[PDB]
Structures are given as structure tokens and as C-alpha cells.
Short mmCIF file of C-alpha atoms in Angstrom, two decimals:
data_model
loop_
_atom_site.label_atom_id
_atom_site.label_comp_id
_atom_site.label_asym_id
_atom_site.label_seq_id
_atom_site.Cartn_x
_atom_site.Cartn_y
_atom_site.Cartn_z
CA UNK S 1 20.95 2.40 -23.19
CA UNK S 2 21.50 5.46 -21.00
CA UNK S 3 21.26 5.59 -17.23
CA UNK S 4 18.13 4.64 -15.26
CA UNK S 5 16.77 7.57 -13.25
CA UNK S 6 18.02 7.32 -9.67
CA UNK S 7 18.46 10.60 -7.81
CA UNK S 8 21.68 10.16 -5.75
CA UNK S 9 23.82 9.24 -8.78
CA UNK S 10 22.27 10.66 -11.98
CA UNK S 11 24.72 13.57 -11.84
CA UNK S 12 27.50 11.13 -10.95
CA UNK S 13 26.71 8.97 -14.00
CA UNK S 14 26.73 12.11 -16.14
CA UNK S 15 30.20 12.83 -14.73
CA UNK S 16 31.23 9.29 -15.70
CA UNK S 17 30.04 9.74 -19.28
CA UNK S 18 31.83 13.09 -19.48
CA UNK S 19 35.10 11.87 -17.95
CA UNK S 20 35.89 8.27 -18.84
CA UNK S 21 33.92 7.99 -22.09
CA UNK S 22 34.91 11.53 -23.09
CA UNK S 23 31.52 12.78 -24.34
CA UNK S 24 29.73 15.48 -22.34
CA UNK S 25 26.27 14.42 -23.51
CA UNK S 26 24.71 13.06 -20.31
CA UNK S 27 26.00 16.09 -18.40
CA UNK S 28 24.23 18.33 -20.92
CA UNK S 29 21.07 16.22 -20.63
CA UNK S 30 21.16 16.48 -16.83
CA UNK S 31 21.63 20.25 -17.05
CA UNK S 32 18.67 20.43 -19.43
CA UNK S 33 16.33 18.26 -17.36
CA UNK S 34 17.11 18.49 -13.63
CA UNK S 35 20.05 20.87 -13.10
CA UNK S 36 19.72 24.65 -13.18
CA UNK S 37 20.51 25.73 -9.58
CA UNK S 38 21.17 29.43 -8.98
CA UNK S 39 18.89 32.00 -7.37
CA UNK S 40 16.60 33.93 -9.74
CA UNK S 41 15.55 37.12 -7.96
CA UNK S 42 12.44 39.04 -8.96
CA UNK S 43 13.15 42.20 -10.94
CA UNK S 44 10.53 44.22 -9.05
CA UNK S 45 11.81 43.02 -5.64
CA UNK S 46 14.61 45.18 -4.20
CA UNK S 47 16.36 44.36 -0.92
CA UNK S 48 18.35 46.87 1.14
CA UNK S 49 21.12 45.64 3.44
CA UNK S 50 21.10 47.33 6.85
CA UNK S 51 24.54 47.07 8.44
CA UNK S 52 23.16 47.81 11.92
CA UNK S 53 21.12 44.59 11.89
CA UNK S 54 23.32 42.86 9.27
CA UNK S 55 20.13 41.80 7.50
CA UNK S 56 18.23 42.59 4.32
CA UNK S 57 14.91 44.43 4.16
CA UNK S 58 12.17 44.70 1.57
CA UNK S 59 9.90 42.28 -0.25
CA UNK S 60 11.62 39.28 -1.83
CA UNK S 61 10.44 36.86 -4.53
CA UNK S 62 12.88 34.15 -5.65
CA UNK S 63 12.29 31.41 -8.23
CA UNK S 64 14.77 28.58 -7.68
CA UNK S 65 15.26 26.68 -10.95
CA UNK S 66 16.69 23.15 -10.87
CA UNK S 67 15.91 21.90 -14.36
CA UNK S 68 12.34 21.04 -15.34
CA UNK S 69 11.25 21.98 -11.80
CA UNK S 70 11.01 25.45 -10.26
CA UNK S 71 10.49 26.61 -6.68
CA UNK S 72 8.82 29.96 -5.94
CA UNK S 73 9.48 31.64 -2.58
CA UNK S 74 7.75 34.86 -1.50
CA UNK S 75 8.51 36.74 1.73
CA UNK S 76 5.92 39.13 3.18
CA UNK S 77 7.92 41.35 5.52
CA UNK S 78 4.84 43.21 6.77
CA UNK S 79 3.43 39.94 8.13
CA UNK S 80 6.89 38.36 8.63
CA UNK S 81 5.65 35.30 6.74
CA UNK S 82 7.03 33.17 3.91
CA UNK S 83 5.25 31.14 1.22
CA UNK S 84 7.15 28.41 -0.65
CA UNK S 85 5.82 26.34 -3.56
CA UNK S 86 7.75 23.67 -5.46
CA UNK S 87 7.30 20.52 -7.53
CA UNK S 88 10.37 18.51 -6.45
CA UNK S 89 9.88 15.14 -4.74
CA UNK S 90 13.34 13.54 -4.95
CA UNK S 91 15.48 13.27 -1.83
CA UNK S 92 18.70 15.25 -2.19
CA UNK S 93 17.23 17.71 -4.71
CA UNK S 94 14.44 18.64 -2.31
CA UNK S 95 17.03 18.74 0.47
CA UNK S 96 18.90 21.37 -1.54
CA UNK S 97 15.59 23.23 -1.93
CA UNK S 98 14.91 23.76 1.74
CA UNK S 99 18.64 24.24 2.36
CA UNK S 100 18.65 27.21 -0.03
CA UNK S 101 15.32 28.45 1.34
CA UNK S 102 16.63 28.29 4.92
CA UNK S 103 19.80 30.13 3.87
CA UNK S 104 17.68 32.84 2.21
CA UNK S 105 15.47 33.14 5.30
CA UNK S 106 18.49 33.34 7.62
CA UNK S 107 19.94 36.09 5.43
CA UNK S 108 16.48 37.69 5.65
CA UNK S 109 16.36 37.42 9.46
CA UNK S 110 13.79 34.68 10.14
CA UNK S 111 13.71 30.88 10.23
CA UNK S 112 11.48 28.02 9.12
CA UNK S 113 8.09 27.32 10.69
CA UNK S 114 8.43 23.79 12.06
CA UNK S 115 5.74 21.91 13.99
CA UNK S 116 6.16 18.63 15.87
CA UNK S 117 2.96 16.65 15.27
CA UNK S 118 2.01 13.00 15.71
CA UNK S 119 0.28 12.87 12.32
CA UNK S 120 -1.00 15.02 9.44
CA UNK S 121 -4.10 14.16 7.43
CA UNK S 122 -3.15 16.63 4.66
CA UNK S 123 -0.52 16.68 1.92
CA UNK S 124 2.44 18.42 3.58
CA UNK S 125 6.23 18.25 3.91
CA UNK S 126 7.75 16.38 6.86
CA UNK S 127 11.32 15.74 7.97
CA UNK S 128 12.36 12.20 8.89
CA UNK S 129 15.61 10.45 9.78
CA UNK S 130 16.22 9.66 6.10
CA UNK S 131 15.55 13.28 5.15
CA UNK S 132 12.55 15.26 3.92
CA UNK S 133 9.50 13.74 2.22
CA UNK S 134 6.19 14.99 0.84
CA UNK S 135 2.98 13.33 1.94
CA UNK S 136 1.00 12.46 5.06
CA UNK S 137 3.29 11.49 7.97
CA UNK S 138 1.75 8.90 10.29
CA UNK S 139 4.72 8.96 12.70
CA UNK S 140 5.42 11.76 15.22
CA UNK S 141 8.01 13.95 13.50
CA UNK S 142 8.67 17.52 12.35
CA UNK S 143 6.45 19.06 9.67
CA UNK S 144 7.51 22.23 7.86
CA UNK E 1 -31.30 23.09 21.81
CA UNK E 2 -31.73 19.73 20.05
CA UNK E 3 -31.80 21.61 16.74
CA UNK E 4 -28.65 23.42 17.89
CA UNK E 5 -26.78 20.18 18.57
CA UNK E 6 -28.09 18.80 15.28
CA UNK E 7 -26.58 21.77 13.43
CA UNK E 8 -23.34 21.35 15.38
CA UNK E 9 -23.04 17.69 14.41
CA UNK E 10 -24.04 18.56 10.84
CA UNK E 11 -21.14 20.98 10.43
CA UNK E 12 -18.69 18.66 12.22
CA UNK E 13 -19.66 15.97 9.72
CA UNK E 14 -19.69 18.26 6.68
CA UNK E 15 -16.20 19.65 7.10
CA UNK E 16 -14.64 16.20 7.50
CA UNK E 17 -16.58 15.02 4.45
CA UNK E 18 -15.13 18.00 2.56
CA UNK E 19 -11.66 17.18 3.91
CA UNK E 20 -12.01 13.63 2.58
CA UNK E 21 -13.76 15.04 -0.53
CA UNK E 22 -16.03 11.96 -0.56
CA UNK E 23 -19.32 13.28 -1.96
CA UNK E 24 -21.57 11.11 0.20
CA UNK E 25 -24.54 13.35 0.97
CA UNK E 26 -26.50 10.63 2.80
CA UNK E 27 -24.79 8.18 5.13
CA UNK E 28 -25.46 4.54 4.27
CA UNK E 29 -25.57 1.26 6.18
CA UNK E 30 -22.69 -1.18 6.56
CA UNK E 31 -24.30 -3.72 4.25
CA UNK E 32 -24.47 -1.05 1.56
CA UNK E 33 -20.74 -0.37 1.99
CA UNK E 34 -19.95 -4.07 1.72
CA UNK E 35 -22.07 -4.42 -1.42
CA UNK E 36 -20.25 -1.39 -2.84
CA UNK E 37 -16.96 -3.13 -2.00
CA UNK E 38 -17.66 -5.92 -4.48
CA UNK E 39 -18.79 -8.43 -1.86
CA UNK E 40 -21.18 -11.16 -3.07
CA UNK E 41 -24.78 -10.82 -1.95
CA UNK E 42 -25.14 -14.53 -1.17
CA UNK E 43 -22.30 -14.48 1.34
CA UNK E 44 -23.87 -11.39 2.92
CA UNK E 45 -27.08 -13.37 3.37
CA UNK E 46 -25.02 -16.26 4.78
CA UNK E 47 -23.26 -13.99 7.29
CA UNK E 48 -26.61 -12.41 8.20
CA UNK J 1 -18.67 3.86 20.12
CA UNK J 2 -15.25 2.19 19.93
CA UNK J 3 -16.33 -0.93 21.79
CA UNK J 4 -19.56 -1.54 19.90
CA UNK J 5 -18.38 -0.68 16.39
CA UNK J 6 -15.01 -2.40 16.65
CA UNK J 7 -16.67 -5.54 18.02
CA UNK J 8 -19.07 -5.69 15.08
CA UNK J 9 -16.50 -4.79 12.44
CA UNK J 10 -13.90 -7.20 13.83
CA UNK J 11 -16.49 -9.97 13.65
CA UNK J 12 -17.19 -9.04 10.03
CA UNK J 13 -13.46 -8.91 9.25
CA UNK J 14 -12.72 -12.33 10.73
CA UNK J 15 -15.75 -13.80 8.95
CA UNK J 16 -14.54 -12.45 5.62
CA UNK J 17 -10.97 -13.62 6.27
CA UNK J 18 -11.99 -17.19 7.03
CA UNK J 19 -14.35 -17.08 4.05
CA UNK J 20 -11.31 -16.20 1.94
CA UNK J 21 -9.62 -19.18 3.59
CA UNK J 22 -12.61 -21.28 2.51
CA UNK J 23 -11.85 -20.09 -1.00
CA UNK J 24 -14.57 -18.11 -2.76
CA UNK J 25 -13.52 -14.45 -2.57
CA UNK J 26 -10.28 -13.61 -4.43
CA UNK J 27 -8.90 -11.23 -1.80
CA UNK J 28 -9.41 -10.83 1.95
CA UNK J 29 -11.09 -7.66 3.19
CA UNK J 30 -9.29 -5.35 5.62
CA UNK J 31 -11.26 -3.08 7.95
CA UNK J 32 -10.10 0.04 9.77
CA UNK J 33 -11.98 2.23 12.21
CA UNK J 34 -11.39 5.52 14.03
CA UNK J 35 -13.50 7.96 16.04
CA UNK J 36 -12.73 11.66 16.57
CA UNK J 37 -14.48 13.42 19.45
CA UNK J 38 -14.34 17.20 19.09
CA UNK J 39 -14.42 19.06 22.41
CA UNK J 40 -17.15 21.64 23.07
CA UNK J 41 -14.54 24.44 23.01
CA UNK J 42 -12.96 23.53 19.66
CA UNK J 43 -9.37 23.55 20.95
CA UNK J 44 -8.05 20.00 20.42
CA UNK J 45 -9.73 19.68 17.00
CA UNK J 46 -6.57 20.83 15.21
CA UNK J 47 -4.55 18.18 17.06
CA UNK J 48 -6.99 15.46 15.98
CA UNK J 49 -7.72 17.11 12.61
CA UNK V 1 -16.30 -24.15 -15.97
CA UNK V 2 -18.45 -26.17 -13.55
CA UNK V 3 -15.74 -28.81 -13.19
CA UNK V 4 -13.04 -26.18 -12.65
CA UNK V 5 -15.07 -24.43 -9.96
CA UNK V 6 -15.76 -27.77 -8.26
CA UNK V 7 -12.06 -28.65 -8.32
CA UNK V 8 -11.04 -25.29 -6.86
CA UNK V 9 -13.68 -25.56 -4.13
CA UNK V 10 -12.62 -29.11 -3.25
CA UNK V 11 -8.93 -28.17 -3.14
CA UNK V 12 -9.50 -25.12 -0.96
CA UNK V 13 -11.81 -27.10 1.31
CA UNK V 14 -9.28 -29.89 1.73
CA UNK V 15 -6.74 -27.20 2.52
CA UNK V 16 -7.35 -25.21 5.73
CA UNK V 17 -9.41 -28.20 6.90
CA UNK V 18 -8.29 -31.78 6.34
CA UNK V 19 -11.82 -32.85 5.43
CA UNK V 20 -12.97 -36.24 4.13
CA UNK V 21 -15.60 -35.26 1.56
CA UNK V 22 -13.14 -32.97 -0.23
CA UNK V 23 -10.70 -35.88 -0.31
CA UNK V 24 -13.49 -38.00 -1.82
CA UNK V 25 -14.07 -35.45 -4.59
CA UNK V 26 -10.34 -35.19 -5.28
CA UNK V 27 -10.29 -38.97 -5.52
CA UNK V 28 -13.05 -38.81 -8.11
CA UNK V 29 -10.99 -36.28 -10.06
CA UNK V 30 -7.91 -38.52 -9.91
CA UNK V 31 -10.02 -41.46 -11.07
CA UNK V 32 -11.04 -39.35 -14.05
CA UNK V 33 -7.42 -38.45 -14.78
CA UNK V 34 -6.51 -42.14 -14.74
CA UNK V 35 -9.44 -42.81 -17.09
CA UNK V 36 -8.08 -40.19 -19.49
CA UNK V 37 -5.06 -42.47 -19.99
CA UNK V 38 -5.10 -45.92 -21.69
CA UNK V 39 -5.52 -44.07 -25.01
CA UNK V 40 -3.45 -41.35 -26.67
CA UNK V 41 -5.79 -38.41 -27.45
CA UNK V 42 -2.91 -36.22 -28.56
CA UNK V 43 -4.56 -32.97 -27.34
CA UNK V 44 -2.65 -30.34 -29.38
CA UNK V 45 -2.41 -26.73 -28.19
CA UNK V 46 -5.75 -25.06 -27.59
CA UNK V 47 -7.27 -28.35 -26.40
CA UNK V 48 -5.30 -29.45 -23.35
CA UNK V 49 -8.02 -30.94 -21.10
CA UNK W 1 -20.25 -49.94 -13.51
CA UNK W 2 -18.09 -46.86 -14.11
CA UNK W 3 -19.81 -45.06 -11.24
CA UNK W 4 -19.25 -48.02 -8.91
CA UNK W 5 -15.58 -48.23 -9.89
CA UNK W 6 -15.23 -44.49 -9.30
CA UNK W 7 -16.72 -44.86 -5.82
CA UNK W 8 -14.38 -47.77 -5.06
CA UNK W 9 -11.35 -45.76 -6.17
CA UNK W 10 -12.35 -42.57 -4.38
CA UNK W 11 -13.31 -44.10 -1.02
CA UNK W 12 -9.75 -45.36 -0.48
CA UNK W 13 -7.98 -42.42 -2.12
CA UNK W 14 -4.83 -41.31 -0.30
CA UNK W 15 -3.41 -37.82 -0.68
CA UNK W 16 -0.20 -37.55 -2.70
CA UNK W 17 2.30 -34.70 -2.84
CA UNK W 18 2.56 -34.92 -6.63
CA UNK W 19 -1.23 -34.95 -7.05
CA UNK W 20 -1.62 -32.05 -4.62
CA UNK W 21 1.05 -30.14 -6.52
CA UNK W 22 -0.74 -30.79 -9.81
CA UNK W 23 -4.10 -29.66 -8.42
CA UNK W 24 -2.52 -26.55 -6.91
CA UNK W 25 -0.83 -25.76 -10.22
CA UNK W 26 -4.10 -26.16 -12.10
CA UNK W 27 -6.29 -24.13 -9.75
CA UNK W 28 -3.68 -21.38 -9.34
CA UNK W 29 -2.14 -21.04 -12.82
CA UNK W 30 -3.97 -23.04 -15.49
CA UNK W 31 -7.56 -21.97 -14.82
CA UNK W 32 -6.61 -18.45 -13.72
CA UNK W 33 -8.51 -16.65 -16.50
CA UNK W 34 -11.68 -18.64 -15.83
CA UNK W 35 -11.63 -17.83 -12.13
CA UNK W 36 -10.90 -14.19 -12.96
CA UNK W 37 -14.06 -14.07 -15.07
CA UNK W 38 -15.96 -15.81 -12.27
CA UNK W 39 -14.81 -13.21 -9.75
CA UNK W 40 -15.73 -10.46 -12.21
CA UNK W 41 -19.26 -11.84 -12.42
CA UNK W 42 -19.54 -12.28 -8.65
CA UNK W 43 -18.29 -8.84 -7.65
CA UNK W 44 -20.67 -6.68 -9.68
CA UNK W 45 -23.73 -4.86 -8.33
CA UNK W 46 -26.66 -4.03 -10.62
CA UNK W 47 -29.42 -1.62 -9.62
CA UNK W 48 -32.71 -1.32 -11.49
CA UNK G 1 8.61 -22.72 17.89
CA UNK G 2 6.56 -19.53 17.45
CA UNK G 3 8.85 -18.43 14.62
CA UNK G 4 8.63 -21.89 13.04
CA UNK G 5 4.82 -21.82 13.18
CA UNK G 6 4.76 -18.30 11.75
CA UNK G 7 7.05 -19.32 8.88
CA UNK G 8 4.96 -22.43 8.18
CA UNK G 9 1.78 -20.33 8.10
CA UNK G 10 3.46 -17.77 5.83
CA UNK G 11 4.55 -20.43 3.33
CA UNK G 12 1.08 -22.00 3.43
CA UNK G 13 -0.49 -18.61 2.75
CA UNK G 14 1.93 -17.90 -0.09
CA UNK G 15 0.67 -21.01 -1.87
CA UNK G 16 -2.98 -21.36 -3.02
CA UNK G 17 -3.20 -17.52 -3.38
CA UNK G 18 -0.22 -15.09 -3.83
CA UNK G 19 -1.00 -12.28 -1.35
CA UNK G 20 1.35 -9.56 -0.09
CA UNK G 21 0.82 -9.69 3.69
CA UNK G 22 2.37 -13.18 3.78
CA UNK G 23 5.22 -12.39 1.40
CA UNK G 24 5.82 -9.51 3.81
CA UNK G 25 6.42 -12.08 6.56
CA UNK G 26 8.69 -14.02 4.19
CA UNK G 27 10.68 -10.83 3.59
CA UNK G 28 10.90 -10.17 7.32
CA UNK G 29 12.31 -13.68 7.83
CA UNK G 30 14.79 -13.15 4.99
CA UNK G 31 15.90 -9.87 6.57
CA UNK G 32 16.39 -11.67 9.88
CA UNK G 33 18.47 -14.33 8.14
CA UNK G 34 20.56 -11.66 6.42
CA UNK G 35 21.23 -10.04 9.80
CA UNK G 36 22.09 -13.43 11.30
CA UNK G 37 24.59 -14.30 8.54
CA UNK G 38 27.01 -11.58 9.66
CA UNK G 39 28.37 -13.10 12.90
CA UNK G 40 29.82 -16.42 14.07
CA UNK G 41 28.09 -19.39 12.47
CA UNK G 42 28.42 -21.54 15.61
CA UNK G 43 26.02 -19.21 17.45
CA UNK G 44 23.10 -20.82 15.61
CA UNK G 45 24.54 -24.23 16.53
CA UNK G 46 23.17 -25.29 19.89
CA UNK G 47 21.19 -23.11 22.28
CA UNK G 48 17.68 -21.97 21.37
CA UNK G 49 16.58 -22.59 17.79
#
């Protein structure tokens, strides 16, 4: 029948089908649908590494691919601002998204813009004890 | 000055209407909201 | 505004709930109410909105 | 449908308030159910009374 | 005579758990579609 | 006795009409029972109910 879609163990079930059953079909399906990873850098964006500051410089545009979903990150160094857009709502996948984005920003010399608010009326991303979730947080927490 | 405060309240209502994106140009009475909620008219008359 | 409107709306809510208990309406009706008072300087508006 | 609405109203009035008139109407209904016996009236599917 | 007998039976009627269960089952499961249509008819607003 | 009254009201609400606010209370009570059934069973024996 296949494996029902549950985020924390879809890849694990694919590993089962590959290992114990012997057929690498579910692993291939997972790679096709929700597993691409990597860091796709823009061709027109060139970064220069300054050893004095141990940081990169120059405009950066990265499209993180993780299967059927892609995440676009643009860094405006003139304004020292970052814009991130993505379509991932699952828990550990989205966790990997802002983990990679934070790593890229740290390599770029700045950090995330986090605000502690008691509630957001708009559709934003907020961090909770269980992790990161998209929506309107009604509890005082951190919103990216 | 009353026109000024009227304009102030008008904008402070308009931008929250836009935030909610509820295209309600004219504010309506509570009975109208209840009738729009699927409430029976007879029980409205009874509660009246 | 809180006192007057919540008094009226709570009365309406309890009336509708006990009318549901009486057994005509299929579902009880839930009411919510909030008031946002923007300051004349427009500073705390972002906190509230 | 009139009988079904009456039965629902009587049941939901007897509940939430241990009334007497609702008990009277339920007693009428039970009298009817007893009256439905004493014969067979097979009542196949689609006609279940 | 039937009406008088009905009154005599109903005046002294005593609640029964089995009868209450049957009536609950009817009004909650058996006649569900009929009450759904009734609620449909009740909760509709028509403007001319 | 407050918990007993709350549970009685929740079961009464679950009948007649199948809402979600009352099944929520049923689920809260089930969660409490699940938490309770992880320690000594004689704790429930005696003392406060």
C-alpha cells in the first residue's frame, strides 16, 4: 500500500524499503518528491571571501531545493537585509530550511531578525517549544 | 476639528477592514449580524 | 465600550446557549469581542496591530 | 414530520428540565407505540414507522 | 374512547431507561435527515 | 465533587447532540486518567476522590 505521509519517518520508511526489502523504490520516490537538499547559488551572484573579516561579500541569491518545494533567499548587502520565501510547512524539513538559512547568514556576517511578540494577526513564521510553525501565534513567543 | 476626528476614525477603521479583507462598506446592526449567522427570525423576536 | 458591549453580547450568548439546550437550534453560538484603542501618537498601534 | 418535530421537542424539553407536560407527551407517544403492537404489520425496509 | 385511554395511560406514565434510550436513538440517529432539512429551512434568509 | 459534576455534565452534553466542546472535556478527563495510571494504584484508594 505504500507508506502514509508523516514527516519524521518518511525518509526512514524509504530506508526500510531500500534495506530490508531490497528495492530502492521508496527512496527514489522520496528523492523525487521531497528530497533535493543542496545549495543552488545564482549564476549572476558572485561572492568574494575577505580573509581580514573572514566573511563573504557581494549580492547572494540561493534557491534551496528539497523536492517539490523550493526556498528562495536573497541578501541585499547595501541595506544589510535578507528576504526569504518558501513553501514548506512540515516540521523537520522547515527546521532544516531556517538552519541552512542561518548558516548562510552567519557565513555572510549577519543573523536572523527575531522579534518577541505576544501575538501576530498576520501569516508569519514563529518559533515554539516544539519547533517552528507557520501561522498566527496567539502565545507570546519568537517570530522570525 | 470634528471633521478631522471623523477622518481619523475613518482611516483607523478602513485599514483594519483591509487587514481583515472583509468588504463591509457600511457597518450593520447586531440583529443583522445574527440574521446573517443563520439565526431564526422568530427566536430573535422572542429574545427581543 | 468593553463593559457595555460585553454585557450585551454575553447576555445574547447565554440566551442562545440555553435556547440550544431547549433544543431548536442545531449548534450553539459562540461570541468573541475585542477593542483596540490607538493612541494619538501612533506608537503602540504596531504592538496591538 | 410534525410528529418527529413534536417528539424531538418533547424529549429535549424533558431533558435539561424534568418537566411534567413533556413527560405527558412522551407517555402519549409510548401509548401509540403500544397500540402499534397487537398486530404484525411487517414493515419491510423503506417503511419502518 | 381511544383518546380517554391515551389520557389514562399518559397521566401515570413513568420514565424508563429503555424508553428514554429508544427516544434518544430516534431523535438523534433515525430522524437525522429530517431534522437536517428542518434546520436548512430555518437557517435561510431571503430578501426581496 | 467538582470533577464528578463536570464529568456528568460532559456525558450529558455528549448525548442528545454530539458537540466538540464536551468531547474536549471527555478527552481532558481521559488524559488525566492516563497520567494517573502510571503510579501506585493504592494512591487512588482512600484519601480524596
